[PDB]
């Protein structure tokens, strides 16, 4: 029993037709009474073929949008004007709650893939999403409006109004293209956009904190962006506050997560995680992970301010070869020396040669 | 089944003489899950009639306090001093928890009402009330410490302290009165002290938002007023950020709201409102509101900061009027051309004659 | 039934030998409901004999510790060096969650005994420790990790990593010692560092609050420091924000606590307080002690900014003697001269003579 793990096909289908698909992750703690800490947080996979609109709609929610492949066209309707976003494979942006907007896949070969990350608040653990547009699952919310409130709003017989807005255009919310001073802080930023934290021959991980970006500070979230060679090893290591949903986006990982329970009580977690699998790494638990193929992940720290990572192992940042040799003798049975001398064999640090010897 | 409407006959009594009355609205989440976001705040009403008198007493939560009808005297106790505010009709204030007050109505004909929104911390969802006085309800809290600590503590005979403080004097907390820096900023503010955010000849709304208001700004609320002429219509709109309680004052109200649920989903709850009644306007589900007679109403907004309110028809803040050609075409039955010539015809904005047709 | 009573044998043993003991309160919210504000805290004691070491380990919760007896050395841990305090009796320091650390007793002939009180936020309500040293009880975290994860990470083999740091060298987590800019404000404070905020013959309380303390402002709580002579009685009071959990440290206390409830419903609850008992004291709810014998207490207020503590009999911030005469003589049955008369026989402030007469 791993109530860390989410596999791919624990998303729920909440819309699929021929031209893309929006899915939902069951709550974080549907099944677990240790992710109470995740409760208001939803994570939704939105997939769209070439020269694909996903119509006009507000969500109830503050989103957090990642362009996981492909590229996008994000409009951003406000009531005075819209902001119009190119996002590449990387790129993130917030969006408000009550935002209506609209997402298109302009390319023309390839899908276009974005994780969003609900952070909820007038329905603590759930997310809505209001459609302008009458499809088959679902009339306009302008339409449950009364016909004297529709005639007197738009100042309009009720025929014209049903015939330009209310009546079915859509069968559902993607839809195929016809075919032949505050706007520099709300604009989109790359997870690749600074040097990355850490860099070597065999892995980087890449982080934005909300220290560095003001949409992220008013989450408290951090967003990181791994990328391993295959038999690459990310040594043990854990975050003093931030807990990480990590998202595999290409290739597998293995995962290897130590934690400790209340029913003495230490437990390996350990899984392979394929594209769209999840594994949640709660803050002060141990974790490594090695490359079982040339891989790509994503990270969404919640609980990210002053976020610390602490590795056991490595040359740099490793917290044991910071303890004296009076301590270390006595926590460990090796001698001082014998601890201080094996902590100085790995010459690298971070990431390592995960070959088996 | 509407879980968003309050009647006024869901208050339960608390007190009530022949000299006023104090009433508890039930919990927000008590017939309802979908109103978590509620839990922490209750909904108090205070009636007095002309020269009378509430006894001296804190509450264990923070109070804002707003005269519907009449005029007040408050005065706050502090450890060194006391504050006296005189309180007319839409004028508000925060009592901070823990601060002992009494109100009189000083008006010699007409009865004083008080809407007190409470914002609970220290048992979420329950508010307490510590009155010096004895009464028949119940004892001064003073008399629940022992002999020897009254007597030590007042230095004091038991029988002068028994007949000076704690024998009953009045029958009820409601009495009669006898016949014949920083305090610029703590200081009352009229709802109505700055001009209408929407103004025409059919209504007008004010509001306060806690970026413009320091007592606001600690508890996250916003504070409106709502002024309609019969027949006028509040046309759909939505809050991105607040949820509205919105309490009947003058007048009759026929409201229209629109909810998103998860037992496809899409419903109106509509009701007409009388004096007293409530009903929460979550944030992101359309509203409009028809006014039955000439009415007023105030709405407590929490959740409040960077609220945003997205209008659906008229001309000014109109999201939908911001969606390009090329995309309302695709999102609604109606060409382009045809939904911007419908959404044009409604030359006013906000409030609309609401006449039928 | 006092819901608010935690007496001394209410903590579980964590863990004891010859040497010291770590215990932990059960949840302030195990077996009442009306203490939900406190779930996400926990109260642990350490206590070590002379010569002494706490073994390496982080917390995944903050932890501010607090001296009450004795002398320590505190070592914190982090990824690029060491920070080393020396703690005497009254010393107070914050440790962030995830900072590995150790507790040495340097004292040759006294007991050490530390109070840590601990704010969870991984797992709401529950508090964990990650020691690196394998022990009876529990085995090292790093062995929960595959051989070929460690071999990999440390560039050694599994049997080096074995002897050197996995297998069992002491019995416990307490272990005996081997016989012949931001610095400054992360550093340790002093309970008494500042003069009391009340003194008299009868009795001193010091308080340390987050207005004053950047380590207290992050966690909203206050501290305080009571020492009372025996036969002293520190009068009825409440505090207006702050719920204190308050500890008895040397002495016995004779408390009333008096609270109003929702099954009229005015309680007392009286106690006498031995080492070791803790009461909570709720926010607003009157409060008085009586000193059996000298005594020494510790308060930890949470909630605490902006607390104001109100006094209900004696002379300074004596909130009864703000409430004029013409209301004081329609709240209490005195007339308005009897009621001031009699509020100004107590000559001394906060503590008085507590001999019955």
Redesign the interface.
Do not use: C, W
């Given at each position: 029993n791993n109530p860390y793990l989410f596999r791919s096909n624990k998303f729920l289908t909440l819309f699929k037709n021929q031209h893309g698909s929006l899915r939902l992750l069951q709550r974080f703690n549907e099944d677990t009474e240790?992710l109470?800490?995740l409760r208001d947080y939803r994570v939704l996979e939105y997939c769209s073929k070439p020269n694909t609109?996903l119509?006009?709609h507000?969500?109830?929610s503050d989103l957090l949008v990642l362009v996981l492949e492909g590229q996008a066209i994000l409009?951003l309707?406000?009531?005075?004007?819209?902001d119009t976003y190119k996002l590449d494979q990387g790129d993130a942006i917030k969006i408000?709650?009550?935002?209506?907007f609209?997402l298109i896949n302009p390319d023309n070969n390839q899908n276009l893939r974005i994780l969003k990350f609900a952070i909820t608040?007038?329905?603590?653990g759930?997310v809505?999403?209001?459609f302008?547009?009458?499809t088959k699952?679902?009339?306009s919310?302008?339409?449950?409006?009364?016909k004297?409130?529709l005639?007197?709003?738009?100042?309009?017989?009720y025929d014209?109004?049903e015939?330009?807005?209310?009546?079915?255009?859509?069968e559902g919310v993607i839809?195929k293209?016809?075919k032949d001073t505050l706007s520099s802080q709300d604009k989109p930023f790359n997870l690749r956009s600074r040097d990355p934290i850490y860099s070597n021959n065999y892995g980087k991980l890449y982080e934005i904190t909300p220290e560095k970006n003001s949409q992220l500070r008013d989450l408290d979230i951090l967003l990181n962006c791994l990328q391993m060679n295959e038999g690459a090893?990310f040594?043990?290591h854990?975050?003093?506050?931030a807990?990480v949903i990590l998202v595999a986006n290409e290739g597998r990982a293995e995962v290897?997560l130590?934690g400790?329970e209340?029913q003495?009580?230490?437990?390996?977690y350990?899984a392979t995680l394929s594209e769209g699998d999840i594994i949640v790494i709660?803050?002060?638990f141990?974790v490594?992970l090695?490359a079982a193929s040339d891989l790509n992940m994503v990270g969404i720290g919640v609980?990210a301010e002053?976020n610390?990572?602490?590795?056991?192992?490595?040359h740099?940042?490793?917290?044991?070869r910071?303890?004296?040799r009076?301590?270390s003798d006595?926590?460990?049975?090796?001698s001082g020396e014998?601890?201080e001398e094996?902590?100085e064999?790995?010459?690298?640090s971070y990431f390592?040669?995960?070959?088996?010897?």
């Open positions: 240790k109470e800490n609109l119509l006009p507000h969500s109830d409009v309707v406000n009531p005075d004007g819209r408000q709650a009550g935002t209506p609209y608040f007038r329905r603590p759930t809505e999403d209001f302008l547009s009458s699952r679902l009339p919310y302008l339409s449950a409006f009364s004297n409130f005639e007197a709003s738009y100042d309009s017989p014209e109004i015939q330009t807005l209310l009546q079915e255009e859509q839809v293209m016809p090893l040594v043990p854990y975050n003093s506050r807990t290897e130590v400790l209340q003495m009580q230490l437990r390996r350990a709660p803050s002060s141990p490594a090695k609980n002053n610390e990572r602490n590795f056991l192992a490595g740099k940042e490793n917290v044991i910071q303890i004296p009076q301590v006595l926590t460990f049975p090796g014998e601890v094996l902590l064999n790995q010459k690298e390592v040669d995960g070959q088996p010897r």
